Amino acid sequence: TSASSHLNKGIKQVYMSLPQGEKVQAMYIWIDGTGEGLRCKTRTLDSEPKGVEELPEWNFDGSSTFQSEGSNSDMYLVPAAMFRDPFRKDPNKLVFCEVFKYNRKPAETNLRHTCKRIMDMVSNQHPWFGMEQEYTLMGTDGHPFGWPSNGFPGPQGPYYCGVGADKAYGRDIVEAHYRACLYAGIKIAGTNAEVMPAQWEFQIGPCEGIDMGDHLWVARFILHRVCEDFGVIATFDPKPIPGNWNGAGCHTNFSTKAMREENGLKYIEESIEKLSKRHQYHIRAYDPKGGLDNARRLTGFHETSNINDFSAGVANRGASIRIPRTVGQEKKGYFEDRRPSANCDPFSVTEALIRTCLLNETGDEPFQYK
Amino acid sequence: TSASSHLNKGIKQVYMSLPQGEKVQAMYIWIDGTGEGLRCKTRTLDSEPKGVEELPEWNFDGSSTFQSEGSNSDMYLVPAAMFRDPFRKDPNKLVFCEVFKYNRKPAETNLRHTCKRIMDMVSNQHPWFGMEQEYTLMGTDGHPFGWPSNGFPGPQGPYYCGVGADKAYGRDIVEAHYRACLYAGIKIAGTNAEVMPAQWEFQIGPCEGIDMGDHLWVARFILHRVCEDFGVIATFDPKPIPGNWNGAGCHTNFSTKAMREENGLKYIEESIEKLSKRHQYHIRAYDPKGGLDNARRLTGFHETSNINDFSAGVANRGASIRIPRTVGQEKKGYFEDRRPSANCDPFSVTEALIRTCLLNETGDEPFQYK
Amino acid sequence: TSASSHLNKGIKQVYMSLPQGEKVQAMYIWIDGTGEGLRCKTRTLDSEPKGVEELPEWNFDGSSTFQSEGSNSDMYLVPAAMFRDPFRKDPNKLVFCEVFKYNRKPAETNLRHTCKRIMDMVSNQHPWFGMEQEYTLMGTDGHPFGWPSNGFPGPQGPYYCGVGADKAYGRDIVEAHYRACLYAGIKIAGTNAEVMPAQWEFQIGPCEGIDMGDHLWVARFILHRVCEDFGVIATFDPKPIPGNWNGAGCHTNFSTKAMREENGLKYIEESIEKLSKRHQYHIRAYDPKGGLDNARRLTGFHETSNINDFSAGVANRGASIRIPRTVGQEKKGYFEDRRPSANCDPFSVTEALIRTCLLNETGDEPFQYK
Amino acid sequence: TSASSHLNKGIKQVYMSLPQGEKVQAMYIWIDGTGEGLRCKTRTLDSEPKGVEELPEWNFDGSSTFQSEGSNSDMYLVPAAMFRDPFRKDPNKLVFCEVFKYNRKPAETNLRHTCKRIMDMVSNQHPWFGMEQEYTLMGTDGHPFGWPSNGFPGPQGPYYCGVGADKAYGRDIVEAHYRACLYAGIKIAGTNAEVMPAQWEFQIGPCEGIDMGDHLWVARFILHRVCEDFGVIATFDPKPIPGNWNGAGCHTNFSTKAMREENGLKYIEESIEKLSKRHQYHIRAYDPKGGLDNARRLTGFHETSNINDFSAGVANRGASIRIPRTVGQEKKGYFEDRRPSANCDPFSVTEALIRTCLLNETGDEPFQYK
Amino acid sequence: TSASSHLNKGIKQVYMSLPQGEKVQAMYIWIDGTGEGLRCKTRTLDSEPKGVEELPEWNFDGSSTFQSEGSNSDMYLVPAAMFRDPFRKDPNKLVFCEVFKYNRKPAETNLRHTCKRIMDMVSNQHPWFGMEQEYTLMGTDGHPFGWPSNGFPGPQGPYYCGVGADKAYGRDIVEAHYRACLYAGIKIAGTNAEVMPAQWEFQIGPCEGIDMGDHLWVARFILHRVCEDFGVIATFDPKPIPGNWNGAGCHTNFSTKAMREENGLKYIEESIEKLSKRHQYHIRAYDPKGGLDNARRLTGFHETSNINDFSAGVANRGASIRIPRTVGQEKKGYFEDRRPSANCDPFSVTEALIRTCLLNETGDEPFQYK
Numbered sequence A, B, C, D, E: 001t002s003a004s005s006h007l008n009k010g011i012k013q014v015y016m017s018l019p020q021g022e023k024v025q026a027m028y029i030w031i032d033g034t035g036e037g038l039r040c041k042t043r044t045l046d047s048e049p050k051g052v053e054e055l056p057e058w059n060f061d062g063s064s065t066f067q068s069e070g071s072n073s074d075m076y077l078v079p080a081a082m083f084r085d086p087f088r089k090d091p092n093k094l095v096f097c098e099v100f101k102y103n104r105k106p107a108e109t110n111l112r113h114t115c116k117r118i119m120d121m122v123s124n125q126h127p128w129f130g131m132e133q134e135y136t137l138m139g140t141d142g143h144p145f146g147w148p149s150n151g152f153p154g155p156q157g158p159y160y161c162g163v164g165a166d167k168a169y170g171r172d173i174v175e176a177h178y179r180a181c182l183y184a185g186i187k188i189a190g191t192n193a194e195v196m197p198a199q200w201e202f203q204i205g206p207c208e209g210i211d212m213g214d215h216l217w218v219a220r221f222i223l224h225r226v227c228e229d230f231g232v233i234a235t236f237d238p239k240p241i242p243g244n245w246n247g248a249g250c251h252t253n254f255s256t257k258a259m260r261e262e263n264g265l266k267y268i269e270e271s272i273e274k275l276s277k278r279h280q281y282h283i284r285a286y287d288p289k290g291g292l293d294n295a296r297r298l299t300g301f302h303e304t305s306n307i308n309d310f311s312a313g314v315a316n317r318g319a320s321i322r323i324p325r326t327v328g329q330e331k332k333g334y335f336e337d338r339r340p341s342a343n344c345d346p347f348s349v350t351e352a353l354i355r356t357c358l359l360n361e362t363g364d365e366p367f368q369y370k
């Protein structure tokens, strides 16, 4: 539906296949003042950087990104992770950044800074995460892509992992995103068409520590750019359509070295225990509005837990935490936190998990350290 | 007609020609709780599997696929056949699966499990099947593709194996499907435009034993993915348009080693005999609604048998079973069961043929064994 | 204008460029019960046939092609000529066939069978034919392609061999057909935009004996397939638009070894003589409705002969037979029969020429032989 | 949506307001061989008939209306009820007819003939009926009028007796029909928007005896003519949209003189008793397919009775028969048979009610009389 | 569909309702050189003529109407019948004319002149005619009005005397025409929707002698003017759509004083006898191409006689002549000639009936008289 999507793409293609020369493009990516939106810009480099360390710091105007007031508005980008650019091909790069203010302090929405620290504190336990990112394809009118105009498709049931024109809306986006990620070097585990038509999932992982946040964010950025090409919107809102229509969540898989090795199930249950005593804290960390967004998703019905009550169970689709059936069988593996909203900050989610399960914190606020 | 079909396909193409790296995509395919619909999803692998045995088991939510109730909804995928992915190219794969419940028992629609067994019991007789899969191309409105809006093309006659814009609607699907099959390694024997405009056939075979089911199902899946690309629907309904318009059937060719070698015609007639005493049982097995769907097709008129009466004949287009003229000439070969509906499960059809013709069963229910 | 022509062709292209493997596709082509229409279907082969002789016989349902009654409807295809498939590329093939009934007798419209014989009877005289196939491009509404909606372009005059957007309608079809033919191995001599806009010609020849029919027919098939891709219709009707608008004919060039060598003009005049005595018989053979179709073309006006009167002349555009001016100059060469309708069967036209000019038959019916 | 609906209506209007002169138009209306469809034609009269008795008999071709075989196809129309023509205004007339064969026997779908008799037999008891005719407005594509294209509006709830653009689809039809009926002299009691959007009701009654059928049928004809003008279709099908969408029924109110006068409730319960013993017979008479159509409506859910089980209750929306709450209060009035399909023949419904309740018949077939 | 039909009709209306003054418009109508088309033009008069006799003769250019050669092209209009103008209202007039050449001889297509004479010769026998004029409504593309684009509606059966949007295409034309006729003073007997959708009939009669031709012709003219306003075309072609679709005829009813009075059936059979001996002559007179047009309608199938064979019968829908069942009953009345094509000249049809049945002519050419 978007106007730019109707421009002649063959023309872009023609320019895109000009041999580019020795110079190299770097697209810097970062997180908005909203804690949800991504921004980016591009600079030329003199040659292909061999790793993230070779990339210059950069800056931008924070008052144009909901990130500062008048006089001291300038803000700083510090390269954190680097990937191959699937939009421009090699030698070009995507550069995920951290955001700092003028006084070189982390920005309000720079959650990576603190999370990176917390992950270093527990590196010997080798924490691994996986995330199931759900999203919904929308036209520029805000109506789900490929839904009848001002209407509803038929009821849920045929669309989950569906195939065929009447079943799966917008697969091209999925397919393209998937390769884009592979090429970029993102740890994309797979994908499926979700329960609501025009709703899809991709899985990212397994990722060690800080890597989880980095990979999910960049995957998200790639999804936006791909959607942008096709002229549609990806929405990470946890409940895009009110009523009998699936919400979107961000299921998180977690395991330590302990949990993965034999009889790890013991440690799994131990951390589930600590979690049960910190439900309220985790909901606060599981979406950028402190739990207000997730409230519309976590209702009990439609295979969700209630936002108010903690619960756990082996192969329990309706619980706050699920231990996979076969994880229960072999008494080792990982568990799944089904609480995080589709629009959560993965840095916020992974940090909270470590704090509660591994550094045994309690109270209503994150302990500060050395 | 579909909205996704109007997205810019050149854009998908751009991404699809990124070099993918060491990782590999596997699309798992399975059968719905409807016994008619296919589902699928994709996971990443670390390298190209060398055969179906190297592929992990997987699971999915059965309550989203008409396949279970609340609490123990999780279900299991066991790789059964592997093919090259024509939608993603090498090294990627299609993985046809069997479906099992949480208690590791076959799902209601997993007819492969039992059919596999029965096929093993007779492997020395080397049973070979061929199936003629008929289908109709529909727009997203449910009207046959390329038919006049709310209307009818001219009467049947010019469309069977027709050529020209006024004669063959939607050949592109046919052409693409055919290659997709070849590349995938599906045993596609040929194809033709059928009697009703927008209606087509492909032939799968000859296939030994369990292979028949596997090949036809995956062929079907491929057809759906291809149609999906083009924005149309493939319908396997046995009578998509009421009245003077061809139904869609799934003619099945059958032969044993005995029947193929000299004077096999004797054995052909012997099994036709056994079949004549079990019409009612076969009708039950020849469509997923026990014969209610086929009732709309098998009416006697339009070169179909009557659903009520068994009949056989040499080169008899109107009979339940047809012995090909030249099979009658050379007194060896195969016979054609013209009864199965275009939407039958090939596992159910092939099994019923073995049970009646080879294991000489009678009665109203399949014998159980060792 | 056709609906299928609006499908995304890039998508077909993607599938069509999958490497196909060892298997090979053969499209069998044949003639309708109408004696005008072409039919076809496709089977897989295990490897590339090295010549027409390596191709299996086949069958189809004659009651679906205006070719038989109820009970014994099955009919037989016997490979006659093979070409490379320009729609699928090497190693794939087009297989022009002859049609036989269940009792292995020639079908009513299988005119090749008898023509083949008659051509063998005179092979020492090396008869050579060339045919000028005229045709008109039509939209799916039946109005000539690129004509004004419910209207007429400006009057004839600027279109014959015209160039420019306001002059030549539908050249892409012509261009593609031409190459398709070349690749196939069809003996295509050339082409031109004809007098009526959206009307074109291609020339086939020179062809020895039976080859003429085979080449023209397959050329026609190719034209229909090409038009099919583009979404338009090729019509061979001799008078597609009533009134001051050119008819379409199938001018036939003929020569024997005798006529080609020095002072052959003598033999040319001799056969023209025999022809003058058999006008009525020839008109019957020059269109599939015994002369009813040609009646609408051959009116005397618009550089046509009258259907009632035979005439001949050196460089005479308005005559039944034309001796090219330069054939008259050098007293050797060929003559042009300007009588055949654009929709004639070339087998019927070539046979009739041999019979009258070479086997000196007279009477109202073809002599039977050994 | 219909093409004729897009013609310039102001032009018709211009002609329609020419003063017509002394002559008068009579439109004869009758029932199809389908028992569901209505037919009509118009003849000129020399002056305004003063009552139904003054109107000539007429005929038509029964083979064109699903009503006879070859040779003796002519059929007869006998004027039965007359109304003022709301499409043409005074002095013009609508003339509802009975249909007879060439041998002056009633036609198969002429149920009025026998019903008229049965009504005469009980005239002293003054039977009064009321019918609640439900129907759905459809576009010419067969999709409910004003529904999203290939889609569904939001769920039921806001549409029953709704007001506003997003609530009541197609009220113009309702409004016009209502006046049309009033003008015609039809006994139209009222109307409402029904539960499913684009679904409406009008009530006809109270009508004495044979009058019920006459008035409902003519009301139906008027509805079709009005819908015709607007370009939409009225459908009397009992279950136009499968699933969670209201069926359409034809609730029938019934009372005798006995039931209306004080303590009539006794007689009401007496006839409900007789009815309870003849459910099966009544289902047969409550739709033209003997109960096959109603089977899709009467499922128990969505405030319907089950087609299999008889039931009765005071103010019971889910029962086969309902005694209005206030009829139960005052111990006199009428009861409501909720079983008849929206596409029933009122003649068949009213006759069956008389036969069971008043002439105390039992058995499986209507008693014949004098 | 026509461009003029899309002009703002309300604007015409504004002008049309200016009070016109003392002057009066007369539209003269006449028959083309084709014997099928009608022409007209308009002159102002000083006051309302009181009858046809007060109207001036007039002239027009016959070379512009297919009616003469170069030098003496002028032709003459002689007022024959006058009617009120339903397009302009009172005091304005339609004036049907006879056409004469410069030498005051009747024009080739002026069949009225001779017919008038023949009618005078038998006036004492008071011959009465009725004609059933069938016609088809077409869009400006030549496709039947309201049919699917390049397609066909569903099969015949529901359309004869149909009501509802999906049944009766273009009723507004019918309705307007009917009133137009009434107002003009045309003897319009009635109308009905015919078997083929978009096909309609109106009946004209009974008319004495020359009056028949006058009334039918003027009715036809009115139909063209009305269709013109609505932007569609009325076609009187006897077979507008090839194949399984009803032809259009012009059934003619005939009776003399003798036949109408008691035991007239004797005379009816007498004239049917004379007719049986002159089939060939009548076919020549029953369409303007001497029978070539009717050849496409009269085929035996679809309730038509064969063009080759005469036949008669009581209530025989498939015969050349039908005696109505009730005419056979009461042994008096009229008979119906079902042979005339919908495009016949009524003057030619009525004259031929008189000549054969009343002036007992035989031979192949009309006797000349005094």
Ligand SMILES: [Cl-]
Pocket (backbone or CB within 6 Å): A027, A040, A041, A042
């Ligand atoms: Cl940028």
Ligand SMILES: [Cl-]
Pocket (backbone or CB within 6 Å): A191, A192, A193, B027, B040, B041, B042
């Ligand atoms: Cl997937």
Ligand SMILES: [Cl-]
Pocket (backbone or CB within 6 Å): B191, B192, B193, C040, C041, C042
């Ligand atoms: Cl094919």
Ligand SMILES: [Cl-]
Pocket (backbone or CB within 6 Å): D040, D041, D042, E191, E192, E193
């Ligand atoms: Cl009417």
Ligand SMILES: [Cl-]
Pocket (backbone or CB within 6 Å): E040, E041, E042
């Ligand atoms: Cl005028």
Ligand SMILES: [Mg+2]
Pocket (backbone or CB within 6 Å): A132, A134, A194, A201
């Ligand atoms: Mg999920």
Ligand SMILES: [Mg+2]
Pocket (backbone or CB within 6 Å): B132, B134, B201
């Ligand atoms: Mg077939």
Ligand SMILES: [Mg+2]
Pocket (backbone or CB within 6 Å): C132, C134, C201
């Ligand atoms: Mg030429």
Ligand SMILES: [Mg+2]
Pocket (backbone or CB within 6 Å): D132, D134, D194, D201
């Ligand atoms: Mg109601």
Ligand SMILES: [Mg+2]
Pocket (backbone or CB within 6 Å): E132, E134, E194, E201
């Ligand atoms: Mg008629």
